[PDB]
């Protein structure tokens, strides 16, 4: 046949099934993809006044401690050295981030060695129980105190939910956020970097293979009856929104959505680093990247005069909106299960399985799209291809 | 003959031109070291009561730009990761260093974007041109202000020198140590990082070759005669003091030493990092290391209660004191020239070669020991030991 496997978009999973089947089962691959490139939200572009490599939907950091997933993905691309940083502006300074004796120092005015600092945080902490904590606000001072809490999370965590905090979940934050080291990596994972030719050559690596066969510009639904009837036996992989797949028979699951200000300053350096925070609430954004410094070693194709930068804004995802982020509202929950006993119905009747972010409404970083496709391709694919 | 070659010390240089000798030349090489063990002043050990790797002649970092260099040390060990960055520590509060837009907020107490930072530094040095400098402080002073100088290079300068810095020359401070970004990673160079397994590990593996005789606790000068009269015509290496050699005939070559001072403290945490620079005069070291923060990656085994630290103190250099740093006073510079000549009428006549920090009256990291080590072999060597 002219395909065995359909895959339809072309995210990190539907990249990882397709280039799997092509080269470890040596099965003829379709990619389906309804945007006009490969990649899906982890794909990037250069900008055109200054050739910086920039993201539109949202800043992509990568980092695993899965070995497995980063021996697979350097076979597509190899990684610079890079190591994300940030740091949070509050009240007119840029304090060290995350929570450390950096940050601890500039906040309460002078050096706190390890084991001094371990004290100030159980004294500014000791007002209220963990176990006693009833919304996200109390759970956060119940760990670090209210001037911290006040400074560094409460502003941040409203502009990132649209909610005040007092009527967020206990269950949001679930350890300490402090370290009691100068360390300000951000990420704690053994490996780390970005895509030595950015994002755009690596994943199109992912589909450049004999097998595979990539249409860009066109969805699934719009094609699917003519598709399958050409071979009726291959399986598909979806990837695309769950409860649109169902035509929304048991509602629509809830979303958060981003908007991007994307910026061409004339100057070379707007800000000396990736990532600012913007922790008070006066600012309507949360952060600032400045996208040439994900890639100093680019520095002498950079322009030396102009930069870009790109404001963040969170908000509920309405029609039109692109969703980002599951919501997980009890309601959205229920529906979910209800979405997955079709889902499951689906893949026993009609061999489609449900796969990544939008295929099973859940958040998944890189490392995890690619470990949960490695993992659909391990146990269910195999056979379902033989 | 029992030996092709003579190497005096087992320092970085002579562990290279021994091992470059046997492995590329084939010869059969003899290398006598005074100390107790290889390696010279690189050489790391296990602190007995908690097993961490600890320097007693100073810190050891590696790092270059030079991929010859790099490629050539990672025939005999692996690297770590690490990344060198340092605090300062100045009136009870640590500071981001170098000087940087971190420093530069904490210190002026605001933030400065990279633009207003170099407003700022332009007129905190407006008082002074550099070209009408006389002496180090002006000079300092005339790059980057009074307040930041008296704050992070005054007290911490006359510590090291054990000299006022109105006393030192100009020539001591060569451009702007000030950078209009948030990168504090300390060292500039393309490749860095720490011997997997330790320096003894490392320095011991470069020795470890069938060619190669190691004699420790054996001084050149006490068994030379005995040994070029087993083969006259085998050159000799040799990295020892210059002005040693020549029984001194020219005067003492002048010196700066380091006295540490290593503690065991009852606590897994002393500072939280690896090194804390004390820039303060009150404080009579110049900087504390906590060498367990080297390492990050051994932590399971590393004592959770336990850490090795080490504060280093600076002076010249006495009878019996290890010479470090040449000091280069108009004097030295001259008996040195005197001694080039006797050296260099050596080799001539005795096949003698002198090279490395002692034998050359110059400091030398060790990847520039290494590149000198391996041009010695280049130029030099082949040639001789035809
Ligand atoms: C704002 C944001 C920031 C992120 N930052 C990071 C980060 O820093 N680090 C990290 O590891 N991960 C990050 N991620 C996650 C990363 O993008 C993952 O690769 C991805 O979210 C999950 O994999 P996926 O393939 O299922 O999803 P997707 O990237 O959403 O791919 C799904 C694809 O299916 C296509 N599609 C949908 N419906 C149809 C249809 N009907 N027909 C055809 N094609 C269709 C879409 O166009 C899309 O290309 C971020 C994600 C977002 C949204
Ligand atoms: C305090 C300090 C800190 C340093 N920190 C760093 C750092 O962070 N990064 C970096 O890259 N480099 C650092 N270095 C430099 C590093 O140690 C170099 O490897 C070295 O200084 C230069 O190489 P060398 O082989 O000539 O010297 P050495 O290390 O001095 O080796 C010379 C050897 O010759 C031996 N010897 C002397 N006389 C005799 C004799 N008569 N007979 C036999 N043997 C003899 C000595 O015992 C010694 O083992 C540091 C050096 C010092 C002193
Ligand atoms: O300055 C800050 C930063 C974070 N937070 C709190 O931490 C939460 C997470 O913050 P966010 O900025 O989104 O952190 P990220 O590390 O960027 O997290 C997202 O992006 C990462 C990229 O790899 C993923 O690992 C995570 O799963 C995903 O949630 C926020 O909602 C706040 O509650 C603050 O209060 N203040
Ligand atoms: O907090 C500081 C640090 C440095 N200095 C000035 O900078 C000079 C150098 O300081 P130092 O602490 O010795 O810097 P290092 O980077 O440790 O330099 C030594 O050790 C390095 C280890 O790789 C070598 O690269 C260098 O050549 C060698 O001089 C000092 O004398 C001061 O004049 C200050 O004023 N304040
Ligand atoms: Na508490
Ligand atoms: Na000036």
Chains 1, 2 share one sequence.
Request: proline letters at 5%.
């Amino acid at each position: 046949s002219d395909f065995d496997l359909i895959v339809v978009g072309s995210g990190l999973f539907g990249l990882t099934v397709a280039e799997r089947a092509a080269s470890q089962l040596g099965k003829k691959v379709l990619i389906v993809e309804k945007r006009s490139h490969l990649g899906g939200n982890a794909y990037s572009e250069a900008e055109p006044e200054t050739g910086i490599e920039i993201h539109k939907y949202g800043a992509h950091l990568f980092h695993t401690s899965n070995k497995r997933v980063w021996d697979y993905v350097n076979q597509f691309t190899a990684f610079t050295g890079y190591q994300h940083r940030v740091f949070a502006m509050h009240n007119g300074t840029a304090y060290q981030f995350p929570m450390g004796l950096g940050l601890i120092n500039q906040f309460f005015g002078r050096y706190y060695t390890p084991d001094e600092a371990r004290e100030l945080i159980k004294e500014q902490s000791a007002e209220i129980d963990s176990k006693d904590a009833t919304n996200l606000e109390e759970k956060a001072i119940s760990l670090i105190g209210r001037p911290l809490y006040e400074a560094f999370i409460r502003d941040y965590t409203a502009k990132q939910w649209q909610t005040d905090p007092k009527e967020l979940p206990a269950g949001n934050i679930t350890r300490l956020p402090v370290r009691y080291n100068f360390d300000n990596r951000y990420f704690n994972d053994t490996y780390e970097g970005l895509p030595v030719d950015g994002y755009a050559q690596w994943l199109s690596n992912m589909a450049d293979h004999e097998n595979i066969e990539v249409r860009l510009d066109t969805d699934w639904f719009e094609v699917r009856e003519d598709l399958r009837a050409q071979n009726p036996e291959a399986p598909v992989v979806y990837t695309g929104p769950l409860d649109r797949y169902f035509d929304y028979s048991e509602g629509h699951l809830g979303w958060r959505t981003l908007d991007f200000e994307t910026e061409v300053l004339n100057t070379g350096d707007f800000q000396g680093t990736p990532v600012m925070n913007y922790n008070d609430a006066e600012f309507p954004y949360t952060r600032i990247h400045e996208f040439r410094h994900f890639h100093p070693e680019r520095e002498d194709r950079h322009p030396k005069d102009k930069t870009v930068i790109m404001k963040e804004y969170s908000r509920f995802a309405e029609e039109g909106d692109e969703p980002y982020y599951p919501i997980n509202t009890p309601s959205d929950r229920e529906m979910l299960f209800k979405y997955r006993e079709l889902a499951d119905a689906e893949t026993e009747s009609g061999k489609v399985y449900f796969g990544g972010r939008l295929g099973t409404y859940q958040y998944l970083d890189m490392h995890m799209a690619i470990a949960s496709a490695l993992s659909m391709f391990d146990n269910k694919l195999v056979d379902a291809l033989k």
